[PDB]
């Protein structure tokens, strides 16, 4: 019984991550923030 519950739970983790797109936002925003900040730096070259 415990084996069946464990295997079903693992499969539910798998398809839950595969279906929901918005899971990993805690990672993604970090990259985005650095990307955004760096991009801002480049367009500070264009002000006189």
């Amino acid at each position: 019984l415990i084996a069946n519950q464990f295997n079903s739970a693992i499969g539910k983790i798998q398809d839950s991550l595969s279906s929901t797109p918005s899971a990993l936002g805690k990672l993604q925003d970090v990259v985005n923030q650095n990307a955004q900040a760096l991009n801002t730096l480049v367009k500070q070259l264009s002000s006189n």
């Binding site: 480049v42 367009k43 070259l45 264009s46």
Partner: protein, 49 residues
């Protein structure tokens, strides 16, 4: 002279780099090309268009 690290002076535009054959589809009324940082990156030769 192209594909060599040179200094160019295009109608008073001074800079340093390599000049390369482009694929930029300049419409004929245009002359220069700027980038996000407003550096010149594309230029029309005043003798050969």
């Amino acid at each position: 002279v192209k594909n060599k690290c040179v200094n160019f002076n295009f109608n008073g535009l001074t800079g340093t780099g390599v000049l390369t054959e482009s694929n930029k589809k300049f419409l004929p009324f245009q002359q220069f090309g700027r980038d996000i940082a407003d550096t010149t990156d594309a230029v029309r030769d005043p003798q050969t268009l």
